[PDB]
Structure 1
Amino acid sequence: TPDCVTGKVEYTKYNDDDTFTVKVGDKELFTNRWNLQSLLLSAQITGMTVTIKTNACHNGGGFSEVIFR
């Protein structure tokens, strides 16, 4: 999957429907994998840089694979 945004996690949102929304960079992406939830808050809590990789590279696109550096 191609690279979408790389950066620090601006804010994370836990949705009504049980999907997780992230803002890393200028994109606001989401995922329905219950596993990225706390991996993604951890990342944000500690200020890691995360690359999110996706074909839906735009506000509302969803994601499955991230790199945590």
Structure 2
Amino acid sequence: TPDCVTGKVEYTKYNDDDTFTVKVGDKELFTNRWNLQSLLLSAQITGMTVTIKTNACHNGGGFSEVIFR
């Protein structure tokens, strides 16, 4: 999949339908992979730079590949 956004996690939102939203760069994307949940909060808490990889590269797009640098 191609690189969509790279940057620190600005904020995360735990949605009602049990998905998880994240705000990196200017796009606000979400994932439905339960696993990525604690991994991203850790990322946001420590200030890690993350690359989210996705074709749906627009606010509201879904993703599942993240690089934790």
The alignment yields a C-alpha RMSD, in angstroms, of: 0.3
Residue deviations 1:10-52, cap 9 Å, x none?
A: 0000000100000011000000000000000000000000000
How many residues are paired up?
A: 69
Deviating 4+ runs (over 4 angstroms):
none
Q: Unaligned 5+ residue runs, structure 2? A: none
Q: Unaligned 5+ residue runs, structure 1? A: none
- Counterpart in the other structure of 1:31: 31
Secondary structure, aligned partner of 2:18 = coil
C-alpha separation in 2, matches of 1:30 and 1:44 = 14
C-alpha separation in 2, matches of 1:40 and 1:59 = 18
1:47 aligns with 2:56: no
What is the TM-score normalised by the length of structure 1? 0.99
How many percent identity over aligned positions?
100
Give 1:7 shift. 0.2
